[PDB]
From a paper:
[name] ([name]) is a well-defined homotetrameric serum protein composed of 127 amino acids. The function of [name] in vivo is to act as a transport protein for the thyroxine hormone T4 and the retinol-binding protein. Binding of the T4-hormone is achieved by two specific thyroxine binding sites (TBS) that are situated at the interface between the two [name] dimers. [name] has amyloidogenic features and has been linked to the development of familial amyloidotic polyneuropathy (FAP), familial amyloidotic cardiomyopathy (FAC), and senile systemic amyloidosis.
Crystal structures of [name]-luteolin and TTRV30M-luteolin complexes were determined at 1.12 and 1.7 Å resolution, respectively, S1 Table. The [name]-luteolin complexes were co-crystallized with five molar excess of inhibitor in the space group P21212 and contains one dimer in the asymmetric unit. The TTRV30M-luteolin tetramer is structurally very similar to [name]-luteolin, and shows the same orientation of luteolin at the TBS, S1 Fig. High-resolution crystal structures of native [name] and mutant TTRV30M in complex with luteolin show that luteolin is arranged with the A-ring buried within the core of the TBS, in agreement with the results of our in vitro activity assay. We also show that the luteolin molecule binds to the TBS with its aromatic A-ring buried within the TBS and the B-ring facing the solvent. This mode of interaction is likely to be representative of the entire group of flavonoids and explains how bulky modifications of the hydroxyl group located in position 7 of the luteolin scaffold will impair its effect. Flies expressing the mutated TTRV30M display an impaired neurological phenotype that resembles the clinical manifestations of [name]-associated amyloidosis in humans similarly to the published model with [name] V14N/V16E.
Numbering used by the authors:
A (entry chain A), B (entry chain B), C (entry chain B), D (entry chain A): 10 to 125
Write the structure that this text describes.
C-alpha cells in the first residue's frame, strides 16, 4: 500500500485512535468521487487504504474527521475536519505518508513522499 | 469585520504576500456557495472579507491557493491548496482570526477567537 | 523595538496571556547572560524587550515558561519550557517577531523577520 | 530503549537524515551534564540512545542540531537548534518519542508518551 495516514493528539501526547477519514479522488467532471475510507488504529495509523494498481494519477483529498474525534472525547473543537488535497503519482508511483497533529483549535499536516 | 486571515511563510520567515484565497459558505444542499475572496497584503493579512451582519452562523471553508504561491517563488509544493473548514458559532467570541503557516510539504493552521 | 514575542494557545484558540519569558544573550565564555524579560499581554504579545542600539548581533535564547502557563489552567504539560535560540544578523531584515503556538504536548515556533 | 527521536524535513517532504543531536540531563547542581548523542538514520529516526536502567528520573534536554542540518544543504536557517526540555519518568518508566518537523524559519516538536 502506497498511502498511509498517521494522526497524533497534541493534548494527550498520544496517537489519535479511532479517527475516521474519507479519501476522495477528483473525477473527470471535477466532482469528488469516493476512493477509500477507514479509521486509525491504536497506533494512530491507517494502513491498507489502497493498492499500487488502484492508486492511479489524480488529485486526492483526505478528509480527516477531527470534529468527531474531539467530540467523542467531550471537547468542542474549532474545525469540522482537516483536509489534505494533493496531486499524486504525477511522475510515476510514489509512496505517501500523510501525518496530522491535532489540537482543538489548531492542526498541522505534513507529507513524506518516497520513491520505492 | 469579524473574520481575518493571516498567512506566514516558514521557508523565508516572512509574511506570505499576494496569496489568493476564496471563502465559501455551505448551502442547505451541502454545496459550497461563494462567500468572499481576496489576496493577502504586504503584511500577509486579508482584512475586510465580510461584515458582522453578513457573517451568520454556519459552516465556512477558506481555500488558500498555496500551490500558486510556491510556484511563483519557483518552489514545487505538495498541496493543491490549504483548506480551513469550520463552524461560526455565536455562543463564542465575536472575532475570528484564521492563521496559516506554510512550508512546501506541510502547513499548519490555527484559529484565534476573541472578543473586543 | 526590534524584537517582539507573540504566544498563542492551541487548546483554547486564544492568545496565551500572562506567559512569562526570559531572554538571554550568549557570552564569550558560552554562558547565558540575562538580557530582558517580561509577561505577555492580553493580546498574547510582549513588546518593549529591547532597543535597536542594545540588540546587537549575537546568539539569543528566549525561554518561555510554558509549564507555569498550563499548570495555572489546571492542565499537565510535557515541556519544562519552550526555548527559541537564534542568531541576530544585521545583514537581514531589522524587525524580529518570534511566534510560538502552544499545546500541552507540542509547540511550534516561527520567526517573521521584516523591514519597516 | 525508552527514548526515540524522529525528525522530518518540511521543505523536501522527507525524513531529515544525518541530523545530529545531543541529550543532556540536569545534575544536582543545576548544570547540564552530557547524557547521550547520535544522529538520525535514513529513516530520520534515532534509536538506541539509552536503556531503561540508565534513563532514570530527571530533567532532560534534547538539542537537535538544526542549523548544521540546513547549512549542509546550503540553506541559512533562523534557529541555532531546536531544544526539547522535559521531566521524564516522574511517575515511573515511560517510553518517549520526540518528533520534530523542520523548516528554515520554523519548527514544531511533539511528544508521544506511552506506558509499557
Ligand atoms: O507560530 C505561529 C504564529 C502565528 C501567528 C499568528 C498571528 C500573528 O500575528 C503572528 O505574528 C503569528 O500563527 C501560527 C499559525 C499556525 O497555524 C501555526 C503556527 O505555529 C503559528
Ligand atoms: O505532522 C507531524 C507528523 C509527525 C510524525 C510523523 C511520523 C511519525 O512516525 C511520527 O511519530 C510523527 O510529527 C510531527 C511533529 C511535530 O512537532 C509537528 C507535526 O506537524 C508532526
Ligand atoms: Na506526468
Ligand atoms: Na515521583
Amino acid at each position: 500500500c502506497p498511502l498511509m495516514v498517521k494522526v497524533l493528539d497534541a493534548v494527550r501526547g498520544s496517537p489519535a485512535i479511532n479517527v475516521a477519514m474519507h479519501v476522495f479522488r477528483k473525477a473527470a467532471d471535477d466532482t469528488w468521487e469516493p476512493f477509500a475510507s477507514g479509521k486509525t488504529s491504536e497506533s494512530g495509523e491507517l494502513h491498507g487504504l489502497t493498492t499500487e494498481e488502484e492508486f492511479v494519477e489524480g488529485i486526492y483529498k483526505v478528509e480527516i474527521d477531527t470534529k468527531s474525534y474531539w467530540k467523542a472525547l467531550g471537547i468542542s473543537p474549532f474545525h469540522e475536519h482537516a483536509e489534505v488535497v494533493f496531486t499524486a503519482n504525477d511522475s510515476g508511483p510514489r509512496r505517501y505518508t500523510i501525518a496530522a497533529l491535532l489540537s482543538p483549535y489548531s492542526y498541522s499536516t505534513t507529507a513524506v513522499v518516497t520513491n520505492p
